[PDB]
RNA sequence: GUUGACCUCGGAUCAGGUAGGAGGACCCGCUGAACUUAAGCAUAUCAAUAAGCGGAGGAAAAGAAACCAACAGGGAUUGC
RNA sequence: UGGGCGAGGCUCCUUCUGAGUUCCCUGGAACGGGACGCCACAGAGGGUGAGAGCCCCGUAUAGUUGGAAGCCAAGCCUGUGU
RNA sequence: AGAGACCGAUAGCGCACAAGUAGAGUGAUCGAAAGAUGAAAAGCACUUUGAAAAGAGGGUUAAAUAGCACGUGAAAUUGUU
RNA sequence: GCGUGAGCCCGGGUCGAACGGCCUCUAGUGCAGAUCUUGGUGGUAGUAGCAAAUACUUCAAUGAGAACUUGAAGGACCGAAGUGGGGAAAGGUUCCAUGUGAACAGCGGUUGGACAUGGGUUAGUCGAUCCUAAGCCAUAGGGAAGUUCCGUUUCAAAGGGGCACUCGUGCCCCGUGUGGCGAAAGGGAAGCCGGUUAAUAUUCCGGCACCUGGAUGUGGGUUUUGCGCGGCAACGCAACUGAA
RNA sequence: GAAUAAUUCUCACGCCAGGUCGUACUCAUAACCGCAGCAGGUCCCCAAGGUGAACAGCCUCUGGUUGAUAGAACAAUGUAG
RNA sequence: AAACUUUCAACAACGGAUCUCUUGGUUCUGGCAUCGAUGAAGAACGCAGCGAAAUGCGAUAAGUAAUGUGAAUUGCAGAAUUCCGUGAAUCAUCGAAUCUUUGAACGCACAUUGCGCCCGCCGGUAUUCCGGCGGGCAUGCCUGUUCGAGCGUCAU
């Protein structure tokens, strides 16, 4: 036959593309049975096939976690392989605002005895 | 001692390590004589400079930590490039 | 040798009396399956594509 | 030994398959140097351990 | 007697969290030699060094005087 | 002694850039020798069948096409004493 | 990332090459040798002797005094004249 | 050809891409020795030598080529504490078939445990898996600056059994004790005969059997004296309630 | 726990199931260790006939080999008898 | 007189010096700060139309998605695309995914592909037995919740 187009594989929803899937498993398995003793243009099609089976494959699972990501908008607690991956360290940082706190008797001294704008003249 | 004394050698006393791959595993001891299992440390000391470097870090595959200078070059960003289909 | 059993059932609708089961010195696996007397092995070698 | 552990019996697998000598096609690429199969093993000339 | 508190000490696959390992050129500590020199050698020297052990960062450490001075007095720390 | 706007400038990536294959001799092949020209804020370097500024990639100068996120800031608009 | 009054394959790092590889040791550990056909494979069709390896003609090339034991090919040692 | 000398210059042959004179600067700057370092090559030399384990011979076939390939017929040795038939440790494809130039088999080679291409190892019953021995390591605790040393029932609040609920989540008993690893020769539930393939079988095929675990029905037995009869006895039979 | 059937009968027959890994070949004057196709070293089972006190020595049957570089001559000196 | 030994030249041998080359070393100067229980460094086994090694990747396995460029790859074969648009490549960039067995390694163990427990679904007459699939069960410490022990102790 020929390839599955990635193109054409965005528009679906997932049970179609659960039975497309069907018959793409099959007759690789049984293309793969008269493989032995002989070789053509056939031995094209398993290379053709296994590909194919790989973009359908990314497509579920990436439609998968764009729509689980919508549920936990909102939520406290996210699981962990939703949550961002930065780094071991930039994980225990303080947070902006945190780090950013000032004592009250501070505050009332950089009010009224902030740097000034000057100039000296020669 | 000699030739007649040599015939008699049919036992192991080292076998393969799970952690290393060398066949330096004591049998009896249950410790290995060059990566130190089990124990948590792995051996190392300084008193000699070829043996540390022939375990060093990137002498093997580096799966994860090969790709982190490329994602600090980006700043650590995460999303898709405006107008992407998907 | 269970899920050799289950897989053959659902694949080629076969089934079989007893499975045995070897490691070959490559480091594969070559499984013998004998069929019920009352089917006949030779006929299904042919229609389901196997070499005859 | 005839008893032997799956792990032993693992490793001869693949200390058996990688000897075998080069593809003959090999040597016909563009600027290729490699004539010969420089790890050849024979169980009566090197020991390989376990 | 019943019942309700306080203090101390425990159980749980209770809810949420955190430490180990790698690297160690540079940096903060502990521990700690002998070869060598003295034309011998024991105090001394090599040396408050090599090896061993613990803990961090892109720098670490130090730091706003229980200081230096004896002057007509200087004024946190680090480096040349 | 609060708040809000804000030109303009600076960092990053990406589009584009001058001039001989003229004539003769040796040679398997001119990138060699001789004659005649051109460009140059560009005669650094490399390739092309032998030493190439003008065959090709690049090199010098300020501009130019498009895009993303942070800074700085000329100068303006409004409350007010428990 | 940019450079040098640095080395030019017994030099320069142990490694200009499938080098911490092949190999040795029960083990801790020890650890080499090895770059260059031609601008382009155009890597010798066909005939003939031979059981075969190969030889003699004949071909490609500017050159086979460049034939995958291949640029230049010194000395020790050897053959013929 | 020049110079006392270290050295310089030219003629002829081979080869194929860079190289000199003159004044200053700079250094990893000049080899016969060090039982010097690495690589290469001679005389000795077609020499020493290839002599343990009793021993070979005739015809035919294959082939370019046969003392050490194959068949037949003679002659010999090992002589059941074997040069026979099978195993543990160790080796790891050495097993079987077809083909073959060089190299190896200290002579040869058509042959090979070598080279090239393919094939081959089936288990409820044979082993591992289970239990402990000498011994090793966690837990409670105490030392040590520390990597870690001791400790194995010890100055410890240390466990496991049953039932019913629509539903897991509710009740009720006992309590001196409470880990793992460690044997292919120790302890241990169960398979025998015949045939079969170029190469495996107590496994494959045919026949005839056994053990454990889990569910359930018929036959027979017992009971209205509710849980069997006989023999003086040693005891017998197809069954014949039994928790802590 | 029964008098009209019930049965916790270790008796006979009948129904279902039994996962995982090893299994080729040598075990030695050529397949393991001694730098090697080395007169060395390396744990067990089975065990025929005659002579004879006998697993002593000598000959034979089943089974297994005929494999250790060869041809010609017979001085000295050697090793073994 | 030959043979033999020695010296020189010409051509032919053995061996790899000399001359020329270099996608490699060495030293100095300049810029930056980024591993890991959200499973690191290291180890094992696998994947190609024809592969042993190196390089790359993980049963989605000599790669997949997305963006850019704009016609290849090449030892052989085969097709693929052909720019209408539905897009070649061991291309460049990289913001979404997959990621076997191990390793600080975490149910108990491991010289064994060994032996268990809890919860749910699907089969065999099955809450208890057998099979298949998915999710769990290490230690020290902090905050909070909950259930408890003791004439330590307060009031009826
Ligand atoms: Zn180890």
């Given at each position: ?20 899937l ?25 290379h053709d ?70 100039a000296?003249?020669? | ?71 600090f070059?980006?700043?650590?960003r ?9 | ?17 007893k ?22 092995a ?8 196997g070499?005859? | ?50």
């Amino acid at each position: 036959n020929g390839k599955v187009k990635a193109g054409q594989l965005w528009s679906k929803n997932k049970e179609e593309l659960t039975k497309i899937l069907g018959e793409l498993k099959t007759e690789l398995s049984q293309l793969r049975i008269q493989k032995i003793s002989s070789s053509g243009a056939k031995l094209n099609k398993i290379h053709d096939l296994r590909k194919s089976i790989a973009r359908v494959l990314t497509v579920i699972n990436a439609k998968q976690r764009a729509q689980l990501r919508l549920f936990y908008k909102n939520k406290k607690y996210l699981p962990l392989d939703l949550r961002p991956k930065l780094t071991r360290a930039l994980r225990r940082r303080l947070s902006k605002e945190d780090a950013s706190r000032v004592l009250e008797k501070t505050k009332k001294r950089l009010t009224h005895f902030p740097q000034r704008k000057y100039a000296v003249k020669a | 001692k000699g030739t007649s004394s040599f015939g008699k050698r049919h036992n192991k006393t080292h076998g393969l390590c799970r952690r290393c791959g060398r066949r330096s595993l004591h049998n009896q001891k249950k410790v290995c004589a060059s990566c130190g299992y089990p124990a948590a440390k792995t051996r190392k000391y300084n008193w000699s400079e070829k043996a540390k470097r022939r375990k060093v870090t990137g002498t093997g595959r580096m799966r994860y930590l090969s790709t982190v200078p490329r994602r600090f070059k980006n700043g650590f960003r995460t999303g898709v490039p405006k107008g992407a289909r998907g | 040798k269970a899920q050799i059993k289950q897989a053959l059932k659902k694949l080629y609708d076969i089934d079989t009396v007893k499975i045995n089961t070897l490691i070959r010195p490559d480091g594969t696996k070559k499984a013998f399956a004998r069929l019920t007397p009352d089917v006949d092995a030779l006929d299904i070698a042919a229609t389901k594509l196997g070499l005859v | 030994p005839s008893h032997k552990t799956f792990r032993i019996k693992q490793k001869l697998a693949k200390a058996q398959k990688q000897n075998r000598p080069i593809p003959q096609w090999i040597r016909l690429r563009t600027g290729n140097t490699i004539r010969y199969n420089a790890k050849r093993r024979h169980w009566r000339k090197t020991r390989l351990g376990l």
